[PDB]
Structure 1
Amino acid sequence: KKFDKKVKELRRAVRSSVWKRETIVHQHEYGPEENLEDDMYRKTCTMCGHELTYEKM
């Protein structure tokens, strides 16, 4: 049991130094805009399906 404990206490030390970034980047990379009526332009995000509708002057 002492052998198992003394190997376990260092087993996770190397593991904890492997992963570096935990938060996932959620940048919205919209593709080509689609033109609807009333001068409306819609951009669709390719990462999460996010939709942005706006009016261009």
Structure 2
Amino acid sequence: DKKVKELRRAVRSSVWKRETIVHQHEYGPEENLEDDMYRKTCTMCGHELTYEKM
């Protein structure tokens, strides 16, 4: 059991490649509010980015 345990994890540990999750905010179409305000909503995590466009 020990000699099979010491080798069964060698291939298991070599399968996963990426651990950190990519967190790029993919905003959709902008929404226009009052006072020339523009808001972008992220489609992946719901992040709201409100900005004033010149």
The alignment's TM-score, normalised by the length of structure 1, stands at 0.94
Residue 47 in structure 1 maps to residue 44 in structure 2: yes
Count of aligned positions: 54
Runs of 4+, deviation exceeding 4 Å:
none
Q: Which runs of 5+ in 1 are unaligned?
A: none
Whole-angstrom distance in 2 between the partners of 1:17 and 1:24: 18
Identity %: 100
Shift of 1:8: 0.2
The alignment's TM-score, normalised by the length of structure 2, stands at 0.99
Whole-angstrom distance in 1 between the partners of 2:50 and 2:15: 41
Aligned-residue RMSD, C-alpha? 0.3
- Bigger radius of gyration: 1
Q: Which runs of 5+ in 2 are unaligned?
A: none
